[PDB]
Amino acid sequence: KVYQMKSKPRGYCLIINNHNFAKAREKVPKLHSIRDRNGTHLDAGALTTTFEELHFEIKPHDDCTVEQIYEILKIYQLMDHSNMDCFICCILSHGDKGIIYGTDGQEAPIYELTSQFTGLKCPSLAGKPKVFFIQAAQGDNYQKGIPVETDSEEQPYLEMDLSSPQTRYIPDEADFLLGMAPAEGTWYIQSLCQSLRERCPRGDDILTILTEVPQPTFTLRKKLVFPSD
């Protein structure tokens, strides 16, 4: 319930510091639009620092491709959290839905891995809600996406477009929080990461935050708050 998360553990947040975008520039067009000139651990520490100032438990992971992310999918079962009713999953590597396998992106069925928490297959974590953050920043054109490979893309990289957008990511799973991406109102990182962290110690819920800065993709029945206590 609202303000009922009051326990020893604060919250366990995951953050993938996968800086290697060589095979991710195509699947993840948002990984070639970052700040290389000035900002080494800024773009990866900005997600961690938000939970550090709250005294939360962060799991910063290094350059781990999808093959290594499997070693995190098992940890969720090893935890077997009985009292802890708060958690957040932040993934960097996401394919364009229906694309082929990749090295830095993904080569595995995301829809199966995320389905390992179903109350009919393994009702363990289903006794509590969950949160999923997504980089909707879209700083550059996300229309890039071809079947061919890419190796030496220094400056004269690949550039293509497709007929209409492509998104089928809607599990409609109530009792959860999703940050997936008419007016021009869209989701992004633009003051979003620094505003959510400011609303954390204010005692504001996580339900009115993603839309504080439309078509908000969320489904809950109770007030999902992330207090610092």
Burial of 19 (0-12, 13-18, 19+ CB in 10 A): middle
The answer to whether the beta carbons of residues 35 and 140 sit under 8 Å apart is no
Counting other chains too, the contacts that 195-201 makes at CB distance below 8 Å and 24 or more residues apart are 196/50, 197/49, 197/50, 197/53, 200/50, 200/54, 200/226, 200/228, 201/53, 201/54, 201/228
Instruction: Return all residues near 187 (Cβ < 8 A) that are at least 6 apart.
Output: 134, 136, 179, 180, 181, 210
Radius of gyration of the chain (CA): 18
Burial of 63 (0-12, 13-18, 19+ CB in 10 A): exposed
Domain boundaries, the chain: 1-229
Burial of 195 (0-12, 13-18, 19+ CB in 10 A): middle
Ordered strands of the 88-90 beta sheet? 57-61, 12-16, 88-90, 131-133, 177-178
CATH topology of domain 1-229: Rossmann fold (3.40.50)
* Three-state secondary structure string covering the chain: CCCCCCCCCCCEEEEECCCCCCCCCCCCHHHCCCCCCCCCCHHHHHHHHHHHCCCCEEEEECCCCHHHHHHHHCHHHHHCCCCCCCCEEECCCCCCCCCCCCCCCCCCCHHHHHHHHCCCCCCCHHHCCCEEECCCCCCCCCCCCCCCCCCCCCCCCCCCCCCCCCCCCCCCCCCEEECCCCCCCCCCCCCHHHHHHHHCCCCCCCCCCCCCCCCCCCECCCCCCCCCC
Counting other chains too, the contacts that 18-24 makes at CB distance below 8 Å and 24 or more residues apart are 18/62, 18/63, 18/64, 18/65, 18/92, 18/93, 18/104, 19/44, 19/63, 20/63, 20/65, 20/104, 21/104, 22/103, 22/104, 23/102, 23/103, 23/104, 23/105, 23/150, 24/93, 24/102, 24/104, 24/105
End-to-end CA distance of the chain: 14
For residue 219, the cross-strand partners are: 176
